[PDB]
Amino acid sequence: GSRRASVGSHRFKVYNYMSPTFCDHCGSLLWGLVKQGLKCEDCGMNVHHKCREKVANLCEFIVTD
Amino acid sequence: GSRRASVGSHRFKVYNYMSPTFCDHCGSLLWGLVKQGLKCEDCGMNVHHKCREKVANLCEFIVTD
Numbered sequence A, B: 001g002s003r004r005a006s007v008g009s010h011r012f013k014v015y016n017y018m019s020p021t022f023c024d025h026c027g028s029l030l031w032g033l034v035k036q037g038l039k040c041e042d043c044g045m046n047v048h049h050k051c052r053e054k055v056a057n058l059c060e061f062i063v064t065d
């Protein structure tokens, strides 16, 4: 048997974090109070702009519907 | 002297074409009457779903602003 996963590549979009949030790639704070980084519209990964260049494209999440 | 170019990776989104449109990668018609393919939100490239993985990610266009 298997889980069902949605599989593709990340779809990052600038996001306004309402509380202090860290980069899921490098571990440093997403600096500032607005537009601090990007959140993947599909899986929720949060990254610095500069870290968008560093993460693997692979984007998967379990469809728990 | 240098053109100003916007340089990134493609941002493909499923698109509902209103008139017969060809794949910018392979040259075959984007078949169907809805969701026939994907259009890059940045540069306008049109591709079949199956051709998305065949094209280079590089996405550039001249900024004529």
Ligand SMILES: [Zn+2]
Pocket (backbone or CB within 6 Å): A009, A010, A011, A040, A041, A042, A043, A044, A045, A058, A059, A060
């Ligand atoms: Zn993702």
Ligand SMILES: [Zn+2]
Pocket (backbone or CB within 6 Å): A023, A024, A025, A026, A027, A028, A047, A048, A051
């Ligand atoms: Zn980072």
Ligand SMILES: [Zn+2]
Pocket (backbone or CB within 6 Å): B009, B010, B011, B040, B041, B042, B043, B044, B045, B058, B059, B060
């Ligand atoms: Zn493009």
Ligand SMILES: [Zn+2]
Pocket (backbone or CB within 6 Å): B023, B024, B025, B026, B027, B028, B047, B048, B050, B051
């Ligand atoms: Zn094609």
